[PDB]
Amino acid sequence: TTKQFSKVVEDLYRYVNAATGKPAPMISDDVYNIVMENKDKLNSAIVYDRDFQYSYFGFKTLERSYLLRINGQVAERPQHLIMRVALGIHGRDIEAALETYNLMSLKYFTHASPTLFNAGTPKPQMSSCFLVAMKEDSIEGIYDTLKECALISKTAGGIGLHIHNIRSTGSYIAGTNGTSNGLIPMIRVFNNTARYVDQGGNKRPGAFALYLEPWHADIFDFIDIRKNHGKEEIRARDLFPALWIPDLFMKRVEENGTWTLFSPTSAPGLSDCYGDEFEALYTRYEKEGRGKTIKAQKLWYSILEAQTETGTPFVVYKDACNRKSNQKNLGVIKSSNLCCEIVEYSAPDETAVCNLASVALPAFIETSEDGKTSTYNFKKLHEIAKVVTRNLNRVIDRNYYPVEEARKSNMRHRPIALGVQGLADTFMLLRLPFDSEEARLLNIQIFETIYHASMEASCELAQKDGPYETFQGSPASQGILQFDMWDQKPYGMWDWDTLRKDIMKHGVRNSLTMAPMPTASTSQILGYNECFEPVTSNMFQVVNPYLLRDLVDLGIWDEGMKQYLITQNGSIQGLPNVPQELKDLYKTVWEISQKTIINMAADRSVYIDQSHSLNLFLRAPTMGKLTSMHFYGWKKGLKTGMYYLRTQ
């Protein structure tokens, strides 16, 4: 189709829905005027040959859901989409747009799907998720919340909703002899609304995540919300249950002690405090017989059966999240998000927003020596991270907010979330086993630099535009950075004294900056493995590109391989003519020590403002196994103990 960018913008901007005779522009007024006023500079900036930097499936993903279409026909070329995003982000700052265009077109990084969809369009909703607070334990608060969720659902983005404050089943209701129906019937109302506000196009069906602390009396039905064999009307098939767990629960379980189930109305404040204060308030309520005591392990057993069967509920630690958040001065954080990476404050008048982008880790690998060997360019990584940090900052300002609570939240705290992809690819290119000592060090270094860089750029922005509204009084304002809250010394590749000094001096423009996300779709566009996890399989059919090369360079790649791989689930262990060095490098996530996965996750966590979507893979899932993985992650101090639990 058409090549000239300014021309594609014209078509997209002048578009009319023929069947209705309604003008339906796919580009904002402001971005259109910016393209027209710089058509020469923008048109001759694009390198159309870079469109060949996408694999078959990569390109297909873009064509299928990303490239803007005109009457069902793809109107945009990948380069067109990238310049649109660049402009949608930087506006009149053309020099900034050109930089983002080249870096993105060269695959150094990319933005989240909502941004690739909507940046530069009339309703530019560029954020990935929203953390919504249940407004009030009332029919009015519940329906105001339902309305808010529906409006948010109109456009792109997932929702995280905490419901700790809702009255449990059988609870008393003043003004009637009836009693509360509890969480399930209310959850089912939300399930139904998620299915109705369907036509976002950009939107993914349900995509709702529910957060609940384990002491809520309706806890047992809540965790079984995704079973496909329940009592039928007690399930919520399109929503995801997530546990907001206090350390107290884990200790009682580990002690094989007791656990008490409370209706929030008969035991107020439990979600409005954490740590020691929560334990004192909980223990006290427990002694006064305000709830129903049970054996901690009884609840625990149901949790593992539910995860083993459905993969849910996710596990995120309430105390670790609150104790180690730079937003702790805002109040108590009552939830995470749909993908368990965002840890931001929310309230009835404030819905936290996810502003995402991921850095392409493999793009920093280079020979730079003599060849054969290859090194990692941390200096370049640092440089790009600062670029992305500025981008996500602009996004906060140019974003279209579906609801006022989301605007209020984002403008006040300006949280940001940089992530990664291609970690596995990186280790593979550098020929480093995922569970090796070298890979462990690289993991630490990469995250240390991205964190230093994001905070450095954020500090520069604070010098230019002032700190975010709630910066004063935050841990960062007192020189307490993320790793300090883990009581560790940074690795040291970068200078933290100077950065910390500058931060205390000038502050930072963003309250948070890190939150490695799943990148399920955006990683598919760049052709790398998802985020920070090992490859799930070494296998239209496509065998691991790196495994292929090596098997060819040994000639050993015949047909007794292509057939093996497909049969043994992309696994090459226990395979005859394959060097040990290759078996060690191309291990599958099912073949890697889940304990090593959790260590590296803990290592990089000291440099993560928020959290990260840690999926756990258990091949032979026994109860005791799954139990030690949870407690191992918990004692490791992780925030997100587990996102999805995948089995096989």
Next chain:
Amino acid sequence: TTKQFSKVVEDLYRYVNAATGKPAPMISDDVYNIVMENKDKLNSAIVYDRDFQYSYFGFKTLERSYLLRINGQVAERPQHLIMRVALGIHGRDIEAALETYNLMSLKYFTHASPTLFNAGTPKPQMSSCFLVAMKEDSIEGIYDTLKECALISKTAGGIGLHIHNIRSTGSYIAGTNGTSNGLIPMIRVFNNTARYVDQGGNKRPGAFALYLEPWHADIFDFIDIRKNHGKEEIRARDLFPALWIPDLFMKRVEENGTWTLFSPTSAPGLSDCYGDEFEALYTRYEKEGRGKTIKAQKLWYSILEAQTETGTPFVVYKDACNRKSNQKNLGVIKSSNLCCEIVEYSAPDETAVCNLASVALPAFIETSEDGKTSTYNFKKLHEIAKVVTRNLNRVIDRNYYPVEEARKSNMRHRPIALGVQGLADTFMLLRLPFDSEEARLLNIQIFETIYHASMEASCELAQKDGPYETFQGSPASQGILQFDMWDQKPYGMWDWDTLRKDIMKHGVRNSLTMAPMPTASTSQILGYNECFEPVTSNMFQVVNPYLLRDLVDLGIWDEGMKQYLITQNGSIQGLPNVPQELKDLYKTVWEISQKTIINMAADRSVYIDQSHSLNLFLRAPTMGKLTSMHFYGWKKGLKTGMYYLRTQ
């Protein structure tokens, strides 16, 4: 249990929910202070022996759901409940309360269930239904409406909701390539909320009625909402579909012509006009090819199949309702209510309210001559109707409104709805066949007096408190009363010249006053047949009290009867030793000419401000039969062509 009224009030007022330690009073502060300040006068006013004026099933209905309970134990005696209602209605006007107490305790009349439940209690929601308008064709308007319906559902009362303004399936949506899901998926959202806001106690499960004009493009799925064999997720099992039909549809059907289906967005204003203006606007839209043309009879056939199978959709005529409403100066009436008797104006900021009460028609029968024979006391009926009119007026002022839209509506137009019960009983006591010439005259007279009386008392109230806010400009302000709008002369038993003169002079306190309702439960308490319909059957087992007496006075009542009745569906026709005079008097509604039912309904309609719940009973339901019944009622000028369609 306890006898002293003031004492029962004390217990009900001091009540504490033991399991919670929460004070939970069942009597308002104001009504409590009024009882305490007049305990002597109130206690010695009650005639406890009147509690024996209730049949077994009558009393049981009261005990089961009406008499206030304390910890699951009945605390109120029927007399206690009546004085509570009297006080709840009249407040400090003790003389008024005493009158209502005696008349109610003597069974001259009663108030609707919501009033018997809640009058005199802390949240006195005494109204029976609300007519709600879909706020806007937007996700926001839909969810604001959903919220409003949920809040209303918290307490007693049914809901009528018109959705003519919602975008049809496939309709275009600006800002996305997705298209509208249409009515069904939205209806299902409402169905789900009706099931969730369950714990009103006083409340009846779903109880939602939906109103839609037959030109809406989603009309075909809408009318099949109650089929128990549909595509499963296209049904709304707990909601009732009601058609808001324009004369144009009936004419096209009768002409075997065409009918066009429009999405309101591609054909605006259709529900915002009626009569000639609607036909001109409709015809015009039709010619401009804005919708999908079909054969009128195709839709018609589906309507009858749906009614024949489910008993729905109800049929209420849009043009007859609007053309003959005293509220026509407010704007276009877009719906009726759950029971098809209320015809009141509604809008986004105004939810019409049903304030109901029914007069016990048999209570005015008396020998007053010499015996054997008996006459009807219209003077007494008139007197009581004025009493009830004043009561429903007080209710409007002392009522608790669930939502602001309902308060705004009721305070502005002050609509009232008097009804009846025991019509069948009346004819039976007076030994008048339902389909006789005598019964026809009595029907006309009774309704003429209740209408004259309600308007007379309403006029007195206007002289005391001023006309309702929107009285000026109404048909009544121009001397146009209900029968004038049917272009008929009143029967004449009462003097209309003087009343009409006074009305034009001083106005009336209420915009509307008549709306004979089903009285399904309240009629069970007084022991009479429902509202204005013939007995459905002459048969714990209980044979018609009047049929019993007669069969005994002939001795012919043995056992070959009790056995017959139960077998022949309480029918005595084609029965050997029974005088023709008895067969004619005790005909069943299935044995009475549906055409005679519709005539008497048309006769009394000239004296009905709003409409009346006209159920239609067809024994051998063929299409052509059901068709002529609809067109016969339509040409008769009825507003409510049909409520439920019962078959057998």
